[PDB]
Amino acid sequence: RAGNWLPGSDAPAWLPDDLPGNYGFDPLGLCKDPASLKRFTESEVIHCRWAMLGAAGCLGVEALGFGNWYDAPLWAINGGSPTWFGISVPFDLNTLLAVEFVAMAAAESRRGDETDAAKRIYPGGAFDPLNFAKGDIETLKLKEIKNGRLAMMACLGFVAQHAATGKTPLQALGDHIGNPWGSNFATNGVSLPF
Amino acid sequence: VGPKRGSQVKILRPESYWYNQTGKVVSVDQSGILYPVVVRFETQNYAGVTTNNFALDEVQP
Amino acid sequence: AAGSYPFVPPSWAPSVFVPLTGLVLPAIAMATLFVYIEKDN
Amino acid sequence: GLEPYLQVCAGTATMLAVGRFAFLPLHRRDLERSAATAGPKTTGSTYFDSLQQEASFITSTNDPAGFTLIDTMAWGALGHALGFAFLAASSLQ
Amino acid sequence: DIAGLTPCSESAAYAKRLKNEVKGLNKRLKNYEADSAPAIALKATIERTQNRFANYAKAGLLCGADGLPHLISDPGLALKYGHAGEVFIPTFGFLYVAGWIGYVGRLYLNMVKGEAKPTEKEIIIDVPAALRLTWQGATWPVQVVAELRANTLTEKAENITISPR
Amino acid sequence: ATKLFPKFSQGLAQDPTTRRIWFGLAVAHDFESHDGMTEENLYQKIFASHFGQLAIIFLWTSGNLFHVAWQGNFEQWGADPIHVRPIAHAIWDPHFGQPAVEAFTRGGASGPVNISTSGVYQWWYTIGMRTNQDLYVGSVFLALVSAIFLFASWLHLQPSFTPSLSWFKDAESRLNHHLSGLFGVSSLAWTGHLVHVAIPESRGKHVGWDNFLTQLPHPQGLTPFWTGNWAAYAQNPDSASHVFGTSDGAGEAILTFLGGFHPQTQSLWLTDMAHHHLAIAVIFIVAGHMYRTNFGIGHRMSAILDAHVAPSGRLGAGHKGLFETVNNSLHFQLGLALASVGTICSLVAQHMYSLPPYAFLANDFTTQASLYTHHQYIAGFIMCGAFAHGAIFWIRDYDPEQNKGNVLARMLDHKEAIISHLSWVSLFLGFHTLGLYVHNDVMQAFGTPEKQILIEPVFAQWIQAAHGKAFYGFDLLLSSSSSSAASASQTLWLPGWLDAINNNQNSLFLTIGPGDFLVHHAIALGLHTTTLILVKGALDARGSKLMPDKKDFGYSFPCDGPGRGGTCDISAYDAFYLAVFWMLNTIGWVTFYFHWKHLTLWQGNVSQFDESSTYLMGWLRDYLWLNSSQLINGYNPFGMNSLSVWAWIFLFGHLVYATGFMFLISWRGYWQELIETLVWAHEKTPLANLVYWKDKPVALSIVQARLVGLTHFSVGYVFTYAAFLIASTSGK
Amino acid sequence: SHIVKIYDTCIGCTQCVRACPLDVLEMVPWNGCKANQMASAPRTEDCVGCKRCETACPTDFLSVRVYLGSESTRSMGLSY
Ligand code: CLA
Ligand code: CLA
Ligand code: CLA
Ligand code: CLA
Ligand SMILES: CC1=C[C@H](O)CC(C)(C)[C@H]1/C=C/C(C)=C/C=C/C(C)=C/C=C/C=C(C)/C=C/C=C(C)/C=C/C1=C(C)C[C@H](O)CC1(C)C
Numbered sequence A: 001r002a003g004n005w006l007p008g009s010d011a012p013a014w015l016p017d018d019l020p021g022n023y024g025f026d027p028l029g030l031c032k033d034p035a036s037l038k039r040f041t042e043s044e045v046i047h048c049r050w051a052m053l054g055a056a057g058c059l060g061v062e063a064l065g066f067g068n069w070y071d072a073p074l075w076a077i078n079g080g081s082p083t084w085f086g087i088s089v090p091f092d093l094n095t096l097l098a099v100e101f102v103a104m105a106a107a108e109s110r111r112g113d114e115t116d117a118a119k120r121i122y123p124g125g126a127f128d129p130l131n132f133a134k135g136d137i138e139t140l141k142l143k144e145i146k147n148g149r150l151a152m153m154a155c156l157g158f159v160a161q162h163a164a165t166g167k168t169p170l171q172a173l174g175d176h177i178g179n180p181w182g183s184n185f186a187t188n189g190v191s192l193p194f
Numbered sequence B: 001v002g003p004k005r006g007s008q009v010k011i012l013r014p015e016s017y018w019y020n021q022t023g024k025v026v027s028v029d030q031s032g033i034l035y036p037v038v039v040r041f042e043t044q045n046y047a048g049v050t051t052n053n054f055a056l057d058e059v060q061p
Numbered sequence C: 001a002a003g004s005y006p007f008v009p010p011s012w013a014p015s016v017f018v019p020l021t022g023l024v025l026p027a028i029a030m031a032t033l034f035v036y037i038e039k040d041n
Numbered sequence D: 001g002l003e004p005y006l007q008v009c010a011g012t013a014t015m016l017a018v019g020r021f022a023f024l025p026l027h028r029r030d031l032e033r034s035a036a037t038a039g040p041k042t043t044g045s046t047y048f049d050s051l052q053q054e055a056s057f058i059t060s061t062n063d064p065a066g067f068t069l070i071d072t073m074a075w076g077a078l079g080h081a082l083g084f085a086f087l088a089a090s091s092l093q
Numbered sequence E: 001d002i003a004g005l006t007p008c009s010e011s012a013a014y015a016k017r018l019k020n021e022v023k024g025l026n027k028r029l030k031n032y033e034a035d036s037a038p039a040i041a042l043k044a045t046i047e048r049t050q051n052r053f054a055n056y057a058k059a060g061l062l063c064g065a066d067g068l069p070h071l072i073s074d075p076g077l078a079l080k081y082g083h084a085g086e087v088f089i090p091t092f093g094f095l096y097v098a099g100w101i102g103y104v105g106r107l108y109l110n111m112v113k114g115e116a117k118p119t120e121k122e123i124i125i126d127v128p129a130a131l132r133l134t135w136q137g138a139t140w141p142v143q144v145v146a147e148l149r150a151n152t153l154t155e156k157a158e159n160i161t162i163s164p165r
Numbered sequence F: 001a002t003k004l005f006p007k008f009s010q011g012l013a014q015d016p017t018t019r020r021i022w023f024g025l026a027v028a029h030d031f032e033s034h035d036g037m038t039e040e041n042l043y044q045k046i047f048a049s050h051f052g053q054l055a056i057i058f059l060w061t062s063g064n065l066f067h068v069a070w071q072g073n074f075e076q077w078g079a080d081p082i083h084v085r086p087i088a089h090a091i092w093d094p095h096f097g098q099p100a101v102e103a104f105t106r107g108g109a110s111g112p113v114n115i116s117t118s119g120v121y122q123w124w125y126t127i128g129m130r131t132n133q134d135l136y137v138g139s140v141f142l143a144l145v146s147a148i149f150l151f152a153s154w155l156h157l158q159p160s161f162t163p164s165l166s167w168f169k170d171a172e173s174r175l176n177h178h179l180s181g182l183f184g185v186s187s188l189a190w191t192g193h194l195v196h197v198a199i200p201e202s203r204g205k206h207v208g209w210d211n212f213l214t215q216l217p218h219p220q221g222l223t224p225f226w227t228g229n230w231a232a233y234a235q236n237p238d239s240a241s242h243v244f245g246t247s248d249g250a251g252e253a254i255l256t257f258l259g260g261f262h263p264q265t266q267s268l269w270l271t272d273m274a275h276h277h278l279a280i281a282v283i284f285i286v287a288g289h290m291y292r293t294n295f296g297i298g299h300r301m302s303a304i305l306d307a308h309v310a311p312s313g314r315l316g317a318g319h320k321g322l323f324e325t326v327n328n329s330l331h332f333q334l335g336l337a338l339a340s341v342g343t344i345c346s347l348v349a350q351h352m353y354s355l356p357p358y359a360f361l362a363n364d365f366t367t368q369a370s371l372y373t374h375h376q377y378i379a380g381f382i383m384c385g386a387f388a389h390g391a392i393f394w395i396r397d398y399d400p401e402q403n404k405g406n407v408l409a410r411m412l413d414h415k416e417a418i419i420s421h422l423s424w425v426s427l428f429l430g431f432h433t434l435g436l437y438v439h440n441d442v443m444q445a446f447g448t449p450e451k452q453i454l455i456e457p458v459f460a461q462w463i464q465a466a467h468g469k470a471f472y473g474f475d476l477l478l479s480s481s482s483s484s485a486a487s488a489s490q491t492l493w494l495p496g497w498l499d500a501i502n503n504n505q506n507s508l509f510l511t512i513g514p515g516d517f518l519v520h521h522a523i524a525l526g527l528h529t530t531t532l533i534l535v536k537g538a539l540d541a542r543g544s545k546l547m548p549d550k551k552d553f554g555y556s557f558p559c560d561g562p563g564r565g566g567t568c569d570i571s572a573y574d575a576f577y578l579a580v581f582w583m584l585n586t587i588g589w590v591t592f593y594f595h596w597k598h599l600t601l602w603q604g605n606v607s608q609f610d611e612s613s614t615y616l617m618g619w620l621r622d623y624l625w626l627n628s629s630q631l632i633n634g635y636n637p638f639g640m641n642s643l644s645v646w647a648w649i650f651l652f653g654h655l656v657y658a659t660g661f662m663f664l665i666s667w668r669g670y671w672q673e674l675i676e677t678l679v680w681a682h683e684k685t686p687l688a689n690l691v692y693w694k695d696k697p698v699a700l701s702i703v704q705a706r707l708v709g710l711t712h713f714s715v716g717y718v719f720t721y722a723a724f725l726i727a728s729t730s731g732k
Numbered sequence G: 001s002h003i004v005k006i007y008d009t010c011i012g013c014t015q016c017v018r019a020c021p022l023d024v025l026e027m028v029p030w031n032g033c034k035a036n037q038m039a040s041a042p043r044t045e046d047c048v049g050c051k052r053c054e055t056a057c058p059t060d061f062l063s064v065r066v067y068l069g070s071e072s073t074r075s076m077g078l079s080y
């Protein structure tokens, strides 16, 4: 496996040992049905990859100095122009929505159409140009799934903190480091009831 | 043939007031009688009867 | 057959339709059915 | 330019193209399993109920990948409702 | 506050309801001599009324234009604004006694089951054993849960008679 | 000897008793039981019977238009709809005395007439009708439609035009056609009336059959629609200064989203009603293009139902094996239809009081009250039929081996769970809802009103605040403008929805108090109990420890004898028979709450309801007793007024209601033996012995008397209330 | 006429027979019970549907079943 979610626990037999990232965490037994287990496994990796990209982009737009993750689709409403790295991109929400649709309509359908249930989550080939898989792939898969579970949770954190703290991820961090005990989920108003 | 006299058997007959319920085998006619296992019940059916002859397959110790 | 709509009932229509429907018409229906209901097979 | 043609044409084109090369195979696969396996054959026989029986003109298209007229009037119909929802949305809302 | 419900302490109608209700008893006191039991009684009703029509307001009972105290059910509203004494707190009180009565009953039923003729201990109740099981229901919640986490509170589905489908 | 009356039932035809005549009328439209019945013939007969019902509906509508035109005050009422009273028809009673002839001359007539409470006037005005000709033309048109359907009943029953069972079992297509054509093309078609006739007529401009092909509905024309600039049709809406039927304040919009209600009419705007039908029509047509037909692209319903099985196996085989169950059972389908129609019948009443959809509808209080009560009662009877036919499905058309593990078969598995849990909720609602009414009554009697328990309906008040109600002061969603939802709609219907919802002179989200809390929970008790009765009968329709062979005994059987203690009322027909009473009790409470909440609203004494409703004594003295004062005085030893018919009906209702009791309290036996004595007397009586009965006189059947008493009981509850609801609302 | 059917669940008690008010049931010989008897319903043309026999059937459920159906002068018990 990769460890135990609750040191001491056992079982999750329905979760096979080879599954990349098996820490045994399935309390509500959502993976018992073999079919559902297949879909859930593929979806997790798909979610991880998207989540990792999002977290990096959410922090990057702020780290480099071009804005925040939330105030980015503001131009399409305020009435401005797109701006990647400052460079004004010559498009409009309408043309972007259409470009996205066809682009995702083809790539996603292509991935879904592929029926291997092992190459639908790990295609490799053109998707592995530097061929990093050679020599050992399980550890990289674990890092991919583990780093992704960190990103999926982080991406939720950014939205939650913006919803309650109403601050950008990087800015909210500084607030915590600033006065740790006085700038937490607790001292916010929405998180805790009392 | 049949559960031992006195043995409590779970009734398996669907239309039996004592279905899923247990009863003591008063006797089991060792002839070819269709339903040979006479089973007695502390509870009584709506009619008031507290016993009934069930077939060997209708009883499970 | 006057004014605009040419099918506006006459003022005596109520003094005929109401009597017929409720006294004459029903009697025919009850009697006709009575015979059918008792009709032998 | 940006007249109804721009919005209607784009919508129609995108949906038809996405339904002629992207979802077309999935569309065919879904049609099969649905009508042949779980669903059986209808219109057993008898009566002038041949109306419910499948036509034929629909099953006559040289178009590669078998893009039938119904498919062209299907994805195209979806496209003519995007061209008119995008233009209409910009009209007011 | 809450739903336009003014506090009875600030409810004018509530005050009028007092004035007019004590006047209606101070007009029935006049037609009686100062010492008669009739009059001692009507003076107690006036005192009891003047105490109740104040115990209520002091309890912060919000009342509408009618001047009649209203109750808040939402736990969040009742707790956040100190209206827990109404409905909220009373709710658990009944639940505890309710479960106490039910638990003690099942304890007795399951003891007489088995015992000789269980049907004759339901008509002629065994008051001794019935009196040894009443206090056992004091900690019913503790015992009831211990039975859920042991599969003994309910019966197996293959031992309960069911009507033909 | 054998008779011919019961052609379908030879047993009844050979019956020597009179029961053959009674049952012959009952078992008449139960073809599934008729001697020599095939599934295809059954469907063909039902299909034709449907045409017959459609002929009656159109013929019924034509008659109303005809009598409103020939004997009505439409043009006069249209001129002054807030003073003139709509006239339904004339009273030609050859028994009326002169004071009756005088008192019933009202609403502007030259003879005794009947004011209408159906509200057809307000509706026909809003849709464009202005003269009596419009009514005559419509009546003739609908009459022709009725004639066409009548011929169709004949055509579809004559060889070569009789649909095969396969056509009757063609669901995918039927649903597609009905959703796109029957529902969609009939909504866009309606938008076409509104945009072209109703809206212009409301703005004072005759666009009838004489000039419709030449009158532009919108000044710009179809140009904006073609250019995509659809907004042009939502510019220049009718101003608040607009007067219905007049160019005063008239605008130019054809489709908009203003929300709220027209100021003068106090009813939803026509343009907002035009765009509604246009929007829904588009959805219906697109939804129609879903199921598979004879072309290819499409969804096979069977596949969808079978592909929906919970992977956890909690729902067993899920909906697999259900398509045939619904397609091959005409009771399952009828039950779903009655359930759907019933529920929507209630939405019409709950959404037509709050949002008057017709001009000057709110002004007419008597119409509003008589329309709510009509639909709410009709809805209740429909719901009883839903469960009723559902129980018939369980016995007449359920295959326990095909439905094995499907969601339908795993329902009887936990039948006790469903029934018992419905018992606990009913008891909880009953013990408490009543206890807090008696408690308040005791406090009222002991002059301690402050001590009475008045729980606040905070949960409902928050749903009201969410919609924008501010009285409560919760500042939630629409109540808070700085919100997202509030800001988003601020440029659409929001500006109006609030103005209307925050006006206490109408019925949009009326202020609720602790009195409403108790009655609402009482309504829930009726909903749960009535449901429990029907559900218990449906689940135990073909099974029960007392009668394990109920399916073998059919649906309507008196009892299984005095054996096993008592089998009286054990048939699933008797769960219906009993549920009817609870249904009437439930609807009774709902239609009494409407009337009082609103009578107090209309009289201006809202505090009357806000206080008397808390205790039950207030409901009787302040509502039933106080309002009945006028109705009962329709005819007194000093004279009679126009409310005489309602007073006569009010008493008539009590008579029919009480008569129903005898058939329910008394049972078949005392009457049977009594009939035996009567038979003896007649045979012995001279001069009368000559005349004799062709059918042997017998007492009413055990099940028969149950329905006869229930019909009397129901008819009473309806006439007695209809009298009150109309004579108390009109009297003021 | 009502339909009376005797199921194999008969013990030949003859109680249903000694209970019929219109001689509709009789006891015929059989081999599936130790009483070597099984009630038959020869004359269901005289059945009134009283269901007295069922009230006299001691076997689980009911070995004798009266399905009230068509009604005649005899079935309705009419002396008119
Ligand atoms: C029995 C059913 C029931 C119903 C119909 C409601 C209904 C309601 N509750 Mg509630 N509640 C219930 C059970 C119920 N509750 C139970 C069993 C508990 C104990 C756990 C609570 C504890 C609770 C709290 C702590 C609060 C509510 C609150 C509310 C109101 C708004 C909160 C919301 O959006 O949804 C319902 C919310 C819950 C069921 C619990 C979650 C707590 C909510 C989400 C926090 C919202 C705070 C905020 C001030 C609410 C804004 C309301 C608006 C008018 C401004 C609302 C009318 C809020 C309130 O109005 O009090 C001031 C609130 O603070 N409830
Ligand atoms: C040990 C006694 C006992 C217990 C534990 C229960 C428990 C229960 N009953 Mg029940 N009941 C009882 C006695 C009891 N009942 C008696 C004597 C009657 C005849 C009047 C009923 C009639 C009854 C009905 C009609 C229903 C229930 C229902 C229920 C269930 C719903 C929960 C509830 O609110 O209670 C409900 C309790 C009542 C409605 C009335 C009983 C209340 C009495 C006063 C409690 C019994 C006290 C007992 C005499 C103490 C014995 C002590 C011993 C030393 C002698 C629940 C599990 C409901 C159900 O089935 O849920 C699915 C329901 O429909 N009960
Ligand atoms: C476009 C094609 C089309 C259309 C328009 C219809 C239309 C109809 N079919 Mg049909 N059918 C079709 C194709 C079609 N069918 C096909 C292809 C098949 C072969 C499978 C069938 C097989 C079939 C059968 C077997 C039956 C029908 C029946 C019916 C009628 C239903 C009865 C009714 O009154 O509904 C009317 C409902 C609406 C007009 C809309 C419903 C809206 C709800 C109910 C209320 C809306 C009220 C509104 C909000 C306010 C009103 C205010 C004021 C006007 C009062 C209906 C008129 C039944 C019938 O014959 O009845 C006579 C029936 O038995 N059809
Ligand atoms: C005013 C007349 C009336 C009343 C009050 C009721 C009341 C009730 N009916 Mg009912 N019904 C009626 C007429 C009435 N019915 C008629 C005319 C018919 C047609 C025959 C039906 C047919 C019918 C059916 C088919 C069913 C009901 C059911 C119910 C119960 C629903 C569950 C509930 O609310 O529990 C609430 C409990 C109460 C309101 C009782 C209050 C508590 C008592 C009064 C206090 C205890 C006693 C007190 C201390 C002192 C009194 C006794 C003392 C002298 C010793 C309920 C108690 C359903 C049922 O049985 O429930 C499972 C159901 O199946 N009814
Ligand atoms: C295990 C278990 C078992 C048992 O049985 C039960 C339970 C417990 C329940 C379970 C759990 C589960 C979980 C945890 C889940 C999670 C999920 C998530 C969170 C996801 C994310 C997810 C997330 C994600 C994807 C993300 C995404 C993102 C993206 C795309 C992008 C974004 C962006 C950026 C760049 C920036 C800009 O400016 C903007 C934008 C453009 C917008």
Ligand SMILES: CC1=C[C@H](O)CC(C)(C)[C@H]1/C=C/C(C)=C/C=C/C(C)=C/C=C/C=C(C)/C=C/C=C(C)/C=C/C1=C(C)C[C@H](O)CC1(C)C
Binding pocket: A051, A052, A053, A055, A056, A127, A128, A129, A130, A131, A132, A133, A147, A148, A150, A151, A153, A154, A155, A157, A158, A161, A168, A169, A170, A171, A172, A173, A174
């Ligand atoms: C396929 C291929 C092939 C060839 O051959 C080779 C190569 C090229 C190498 C490959 C590629 C790969 C890739 C693409 C990768 C990616 C990665 C990533 C991006 C990750 C992220 C990842 C990401 C992540 C985890 C995230 C994380 C986050 C976290 C923790 C947290 C955060 C935050 C919060 C909440 C709030 C505060 O206030 C602040 C902070 C604290 C700041």
Ligand SMILES: CC1=C(/C=C/C(C)=C\C=C\C(C)=C/C=C/C=C(C)\C=C\C=C(C)\C=C\C2=C(C)C[C@@H](O)CC2(C)C)C(C)(C)CCC1
Binding pocket: E073, E074, E075, E087, E088, E091, E098, E099, E100, E101, E102, E103, E106, E140, E144, E153
């Ligand atoms: C917070 C609270 C309320 C909130 C209620 C809400 C939001 C949800 C309520 C769910 C509720 C009340 C109940 C769900 C019950 C479901 C189950 C399966 C429990 C069944 C209980 C059982 C079987 C126990 C029975 C008992 C046993 C075995 C022994 C004895 O304990 C006696 C007995 C019969 C109790 C509101 C209404 C606002 C109001 C304010 C109190």
Ligand SMILES: CC1=C(/C=C/C(C)=C/C=C/C(C)=C/C=C/C=C(C)/C=C/C=C(C)/C=C/C2=C(C)CCCC2(C)C)C(C)(C)CCC1
Binding pocket: D012, D016, D072, D073, D074, D075, D076, D077, D078, D080, D081, D084, F282
């Ligand atoms: C041959 C071929 C091809 C193709 C071509 C084309 C051009 C195609 C297209 C076709 C098309 C072109 C299709 C379409 C279809 C569509 C339809 C058939 C429908 C339409 C319309 C609509 C759907 C609308 C609707 C509506 C209205 C009416 C009103 C308003 C509202 C709405 C909009 C909704 C190519 C060249 C590539 C190459 C090879 C050969």
Ligand SMILES: CC1=C(/C=C/C(C)=C\C=C\C(C)=C\C=C\C=C(C)\C=C\C=C(C)/C=C/C2=C(C)CCCC2(C)C)C(C)(C)CCC1
Binding pocket: F061, F065, F124, F137, F138, F139, F141, F142, F213
């Ligand atoms: C009578 C009456 C009624 C009833 C109604 C119904 C039930 C039905 C009707 C129906 C109708 C009476 C309808 C109408 C129709 C007409 C039309 C329909 C025409 C049109 C014309 C034109 C010229 C157009 C054409 C077209 C189309 C169609 C499509 C597209 C294209 C176009 C536009 C070209 C009521 C009760 C309400 C009341 C009052 C009286």
Ligand SMILES: CCCCCCCCCCCCO[C@@H]1O[C@H](CO)[C@@H](O[C@H]2O[C@H](CO)[C@@H](O)[C@H](O)[C@H]2O)[C@H](O)[C@H]1O
Binding pocket: A108, A109, A111, A112, A113, D026
């Ligand atoms: C901001 C954007 C948010 C996401 C927007 C898109 C939502 C997700 C797509 C919805 C439409 C999916 O459309 C379709 O889904 C099915 C269901 O798995 C996929 O189907 C694919 O996986 C299933 C899994 O059982 C296979 O049986 C099938 O052979 C395969 O093609 C298709 O590849 C995809 O084209």
Ligand code: SF4
Binding pocket: F558, F559, F560, F561, F562, F563, F566, F567, F568, F569, F667, F702
């Ligand atoms: S009294 Fe009537 S309903 Fe009851 S068991 Fe006897 S015959 Fe049947």
Ligand SMILES: [Ca+2]
Binding pocket: F128, F129, F130, F131, F134, F201, F206, F207, F208
């Ligand atoms: Ca006109």
